[PDB]
Amino acid sequence: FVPDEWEVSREKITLLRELGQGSFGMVYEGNARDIIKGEAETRVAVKTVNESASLRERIEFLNEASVMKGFTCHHVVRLLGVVSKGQPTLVVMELMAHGDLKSYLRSLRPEAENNPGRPPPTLQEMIQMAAEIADGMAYLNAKKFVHRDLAARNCMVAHDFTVKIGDFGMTRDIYETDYYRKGGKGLLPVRWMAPESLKDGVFTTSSDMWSFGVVLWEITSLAEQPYQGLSNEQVLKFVMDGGYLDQPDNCPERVTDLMRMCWQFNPKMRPTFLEIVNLLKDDLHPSFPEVSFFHSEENK
Amino acid sequence: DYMNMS
Numbered sequence: 001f002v003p004d005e006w007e008v009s010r011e012k013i014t015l016l017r018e019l020g021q022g023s024f025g026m027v028y029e030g031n032a033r034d035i036i037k038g039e040a041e042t043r044v045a046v047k048t049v050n051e052s053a054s055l056r057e058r059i060e061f062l063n064e065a066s067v068m069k070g071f072t073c074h075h076v077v078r079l080l081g082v083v084s085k086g087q088p089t090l091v092v093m094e095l096m097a098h099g100d101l102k103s104y105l106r107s108l109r110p111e112a113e114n115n116p117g118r119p120p121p122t123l124q125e126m127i128q129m130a131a132e133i134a135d136g137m138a139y140l141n142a143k144k145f146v147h148r149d150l151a152a153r154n155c156m157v158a159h160d161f162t163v164k165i166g167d168f169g170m171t172r173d174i175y176e177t178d179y180y181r182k183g184g185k186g187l188l189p190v191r192w193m194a195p196e197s198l199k200d201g202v203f204t205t206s207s208d209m210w211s212f213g214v215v216l217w218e219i220t221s222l223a224e225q226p227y228q229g230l231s232n233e234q235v236l237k238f239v240m241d242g243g244y245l246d247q248p249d250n251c252p253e254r255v256t257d258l259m260r261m262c263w264q265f266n267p268k269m270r271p272t273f274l275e276i277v278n279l280l281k282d283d284l285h286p287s288f289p290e291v292s293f294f295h296s297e298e299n300k
Numbered sequence: 301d302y303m304n305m306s
């Protein structure tokens with residue numbers, strides 16, 4: 001625990017409903033009161049964990065807030081304040097009007113019971129997402145961090161349909177180390193991790209890069225389940241053996257080309273997120289340059 | 301889809 005500069009008074013917080021259960025916490029939608037410059041009512045997302053939950057988990061939580069206190073990037077959901085005072089601990093953050101990317105993607109299938117009345121994303125639209133997602137993962141490795149769990153569900157859509165990286169439960173610090181040779185005994189997303197980490201537990205920039213191609217696969221397949229039909233033990237053997245995911249039908253060719261570059265069996269061959277943004281800067285939204293990171297001065 | 305393992 002331990003109160004910070006981010007500390008917030010619990011009284012200002014009111015919880016409305018349950019948005020969902022994530023990698024390990026609980027996410028409620030609520031309204032903060034006078035927390036930002038201007039408005040007195042700024043509905044937010046509140047992630048919490050049970051003070052009746054495993055110490056390992058509880059710690060995983062402390063860590064998530066910790067690494068969010070930095071992270072000032074357009075394409076990263078903003079941490080908004082903590083509430084360590086008493087019970088229970090409450091981490092607040094900017095609510096993303098359109099939920100996770102996964103859920104949002106599915107809601108666009110022509111079929112869809114919850115379809116918002118618009119067509120599945122145009123090719124223009126996909127590039128944009130891919131870019132802000134990548135931009136954000138770049139900002140990450142920049143501040144020296146591996147995300148270890150990049151996937152549609154952990155990407156939130158803002159109101160302007162902008163995409164930002166969310167959920168940093170597996171994110172790790174990397175001067176020195178610049179790994180984990182893993183550790184053992186823990187929940188892992190096999191469908192999204194690179195082959196090395198699947199055997200030689202590790203996780204690196206090139207690793208998240210692998211996870212990144214799967215998000216594109218997710219985007220294109222409209223949130224079909226990666227490696228559907230297979231069991232987690234089967235996929236485990238497969239991607240380790242030397243296999244890779246397929247390719248959605250009617251899938252554009254520019255993207256497919258990206259996916260491939262993310263799937264070399266050798267990590268030293270995966271492009272860098274920055275290198276990915278570059279390949280896409282000439283086809284983005286005229287606004288991207290200003291809120292960007294690829295253009296941010298910090299990109300040293 | 302976070303299967304335990306090593």
Ligand SMILES: Cc1cccc(Nc2nc(Nc3ccc(CC(=O)O)cc3)ncc2C(N)=O)c1
Nearest residue numbers: 019020021022027045094095096097098099100
């Ligand atoms: C409107 C809406 C609807 C659903 C989720 C969110 N927002 C958020 N959701 C999560 N985790 C989160 C991610 C995926 C799920 C979907 C599922 O149930 O599997 C639930 C919660 N984390 C941060 C935010 C946020 N800060 O906006 C917002």
